[PDB]
């Protein structure tokens, strides 16, 4: 939902701010990369003939096989204020956003780009040994800080405030420490560019003027930039957030020139194998992956034993499992990490037996677990034995007259989120204390 979250934030952004964002070719290129192939086809079809088209022509062109994705593309196209659907002359005249259109046209023709590609200095240096290594150093420091092992190079103060204010790595000052939330463990499980998107989403959510379109345009040309070159130090807010993301380790800046590392391209797009972990009924780990980061993240929920060059070993204990469960880590998160670290031999055998049993029957008189459950279900039954309860504390009523208070003040209460427990035939249903706003008036009336 990453591009979906981006599109959602853009639709939250009001129409004229969006149109201000559609002014420049680099931003329009980034949004062009965001949109699905159908909407991309629509805008490239429209960009070279300036004719408002009725919707019925689009309906004639579209084969109904991709009609659902067509509707998704045009619904995003309309809600992003990028389409102008008006039923002029009775039929829905369709129009692409004109600022977006001309900026895409200039980007494609190589016309007026206003250095939205980048205000270049073009005094390039080596990036493998300076930029990549500085990026790796700073990002290693923040990754081990997000692991929880002590490390000297702490993050910056504004991103420390980001971790404090945000629900991501809650810096619990009563305990005095940063703490992994369940949202923090989801953040850990996220892809690298997903993590980048999470960081910028929280930072833009909390930052206020620091102009909003300055953030948007600057970030979009930051994604549009290339590697290993010097560039001119742009707006003032863009420059101060440029120095901020320099402190993030994103750019190697020599205090007007700056050298964007591999992370700009990582933000632009992504990139017995590495990370293929042999599961065991013995609950012993033969990982096909070794890093200090790997040991750092695996120590949170595994008793480990020793590190070799690719195979760091140890043992899963139920104490480690309960440690993870008490860390706020979801059992779903743990098992999701387990499919991210599955191994080819067991995968091949599971596929062969999957085809073998689907040749017999789909039911098989057993619960469904495609990966070998002897490592998994033993944890998963203990993971089923993790929570296994539910507690209501607060207001509670009982012994109703009839079912008059369950199909309209409990079904519509289900549509608004005010009750906690729904039991129609017991004549008792539990509500939250804060969610007593609109439960107890139609009960009175």
């Amino acid at each position: 939902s990453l591009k979906h979250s981006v599109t959602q934030y853009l639709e939250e952004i009001p129409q004229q701010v969006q149109n201000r964002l559609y002014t420049s070719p680099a931003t329009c290129l980034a949004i062009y990369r965001i949109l699905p192939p159908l909407a991309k086809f629509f805008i490239m079809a429209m960009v070279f003939n300036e004719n408002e088209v009725p919707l019925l022509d689009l309906d004639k062109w579209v084969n109904s096989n991709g009609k659902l994705q067509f509707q998704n593309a045009i619904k995003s196209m309309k809600s992003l204020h990028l389409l102008i659907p008006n039923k002029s002359s009775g039929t829905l005249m369709i129009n692409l956003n004109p600022t977006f259109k001309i900026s895409l046209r200039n980007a494609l023709t190589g016309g007026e780009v206003q250095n939205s590609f980048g205000v270049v200095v073009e005094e390039n240096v080596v990036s493998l040994d300076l930029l990549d290594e500085y990026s790796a150093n700073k990002w290693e420091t923040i990754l081990h800080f997000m692991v929880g092992t002590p490390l000297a190079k702490i993050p910056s103060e504004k991103v420390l405030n980001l971790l404090k204010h945000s629900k991501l790595m809650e810096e619990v000052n009563s305990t005095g420490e940063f703490k992994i939330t369940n949202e923090g463990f989801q953040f850990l499980l996220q892809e690298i560019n997903s993590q980048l998107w999470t960081l910028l989403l929280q930072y833009l959510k909390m930052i206020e003027t620091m102009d909003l379109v300055d953030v948007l345009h600057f970030i979009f040309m930051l994604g549009a930039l290339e590697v290993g070159k010097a560039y001119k130090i742009l707006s003032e807010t863009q420059r101060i957030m440029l120095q901020d993301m320099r402190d993030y380790g994103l750019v190697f800046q020599k205090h007007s020139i700056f050298y964007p590392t591999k992370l700009a391209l990582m933000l632009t797009s992504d990139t017995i194998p590495d990370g293929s972990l042999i599961v065991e009924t013995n609950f012993k780990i033969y990982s096909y992956s070794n890093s200090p980061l790997q040991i750092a993240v695996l120590s949170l929920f595994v008793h480990l034993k020793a590190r070799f060059v690719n195979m760091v070993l140890g043992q899963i204990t139920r104490e480690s499992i309960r440690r993870a469960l008490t860390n706020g880590i979801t059992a779903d998160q743990i098992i999701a990490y387990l499919e991210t670290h599955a191994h080819p031999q067991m995968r091949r055998l599971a596929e062969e037996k999957l085809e073998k049993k689907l040749e017999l029957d789909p039911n098989c008189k057993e619960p469904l677990q495609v990966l070998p459950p002897t490592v998994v279900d033993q944890i998963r039954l203990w993971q089923l034995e993790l929570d296994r309860v539910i507690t209501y504390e607060g207001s509670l009523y009982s012994d109703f007259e009839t079912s008059q208070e369950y199909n309209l003040l409990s079904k519509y209460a289900q549509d608004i989120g005010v009750l906690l427990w729904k039991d129609d035939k017991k004549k008792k249903f539990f509500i939250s204390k804060e969610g007593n706003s609109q439960v107890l008036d139609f009960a009175k009336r």
Partner: protein
């Protein structure tokens, strides 16, 4: 044998059996032979390979084998009595066939009959087992012992013949048969007791041997050279692929129902190199949205017709009732059968088939009238709304029918007039 087209047409009972096996072939048969009046001789004359396939399917038999070694009785023993196995035993052993042919209808019933047959001494004797005198067997079947022994001697007599000379060991043993030395040991003589009577392993070897020669004579049924087999090709010339090569001569003929100069192409090359090194403009290529509008008009003109075709890019669902639908289907099928027979008629190229062409042409005219009255009936019973569908669906076959009529008329006027 009975493999000619004449014999395949002659086997009417086989035709009956294969017709009774098939279903749509029966329906075609009533519509042609019974309803229209087609002679079955040229009904089946278009189906001669299928008749041959059915004749081959019916007219085949398996290779022989030893039923007795394979089958074990497995306390009354359970039997999976198969009539195919029973007849296997019958023409394996005519002694068993003769014991069967006088016992079932005259003396005792079939289940008691095969119970005695499993009980019998000859059962386990002719089976892979030396017969034991302790066994009671079946005393009725014990009368067949000397009869089967007579069969053994008679079969030995018909099997015995002069032996090929180089193979023959009797020439070796009779090379010097007057040798008076010393006899060999007890090892070299056959297994006998202290009374000199044998165990009969030579006898059972004779029996299994005679089974092998019955196999040999079963192959050797109704259904000089020494130089070549003594010649050795190991030190001779290998076989040569005498395959002919093919060479090609190629001269394609051109199709049957302005020129620039070197100076012109040189100066245009000079001009285009001048323009190339001169300048390339980016945004000059955008059309003027009116010439682009006519481009769109042409494109959408293509799209409308092509996508209208692409709207219609088991069979398709039909609004016809199933009775009328199947009637049209079967009439179409039998008219196709007529027209294939008409191509047989016309491509025959014989004056012998002239009356056949005439009478079939009358049948085709009857088919034409059947189609016309069919379309009239669907018209007056449906208001033509789906009779149009019927006529359009049956249109191409009647079009080729009219093609056949016009060919017949034109060739008749050419030859006769």
């Amino acid at each position: 044998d009975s493999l000619s087209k004449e014999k395949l047409l002659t086997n009417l009972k086989l035709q009956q059996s294969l017709l009774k096996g098939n279903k749509v072939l029966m329906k075609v048969f009533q519509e042609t032979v019974i309803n229209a009046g087609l002679p079955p001789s040229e009904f089946w004359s278009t189906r001669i390979p299928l008749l041959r396939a059915f004749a081959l399917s019916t007219s085949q038999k398996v290779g022989p084998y030893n039923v007795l070694s394979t089958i074990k009785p497995v306390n009354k023993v359970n039997v999976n009595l198969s009539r195919e196995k029973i007849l296997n035993i019958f023409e394996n052993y005519p002694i068993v066939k003769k014991a069967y042919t006088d016992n079932v209808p005259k003396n005792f019933k079939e289940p008691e009959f095969w119970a005695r047959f499993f009980s019998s001494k000859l059962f386990r004797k002719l089976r892979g087992e030396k017969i034991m005198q302790n066994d009671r067997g079946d005393v009725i079947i014990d009368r067949y012992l000397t009869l089967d022994q007579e069969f053994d001697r008679k079969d030995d007599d018909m099997l015995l013949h002069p032996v090929k000379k180089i193979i023959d060991l009797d020439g070796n043993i009779q090379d010097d048969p007057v040798v008076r030395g010393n006899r060999p040991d007890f090892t070299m003589q056959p297994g006998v007791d202290i009374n000199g009577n044998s165990d009969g392993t030579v006898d059972i070897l004779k029996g299994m041997n005679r089974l092998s020669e019955k196999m040999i004579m079963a192959l050797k049924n109704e259904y000089n050279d020494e130089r070549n087999e003594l010649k050795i090709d190991d030190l001779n010339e290998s076989y040569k692929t005498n395959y002919a090569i093919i060479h090609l001569k190629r001269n394609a003929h051109e199709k049957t129902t302005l020129k620039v100069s070197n100076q012109q192409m040189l100066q245009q090359l000079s001009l285009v190199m001048d323009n190339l090194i001169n300048k390339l403009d980016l945004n000059q290529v955008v059309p003027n949205n009116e010439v682009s509008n006519k481009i769109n008009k042409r494109v959408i003109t293509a799209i409308k017709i092509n996508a209208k075709q692409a709207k219609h890019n088991l069979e398709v669902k039909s609004t016809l009732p199933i009775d009328l639908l199947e009637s049209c289907r079967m009439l179409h099928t039998t008219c196709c059968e007529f027209l294939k027979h008409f191509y047989i008629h016309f491509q025959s190229g014989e004056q012998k088939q002239a009356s056949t062409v005439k009478k079939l042409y009358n049948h085709l005219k009857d088919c034409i009238e059947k189609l016309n009255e069919l379309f009239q009936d669907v018209l007056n019973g449906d208001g033509e709304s789906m009779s149009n569908t019927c006529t359009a669906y049956l249109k191409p076959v009647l079009n080729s029918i009219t093609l056949a009529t016009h060919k017949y008329d034109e060739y008749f006027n050419e030859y006769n007039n």
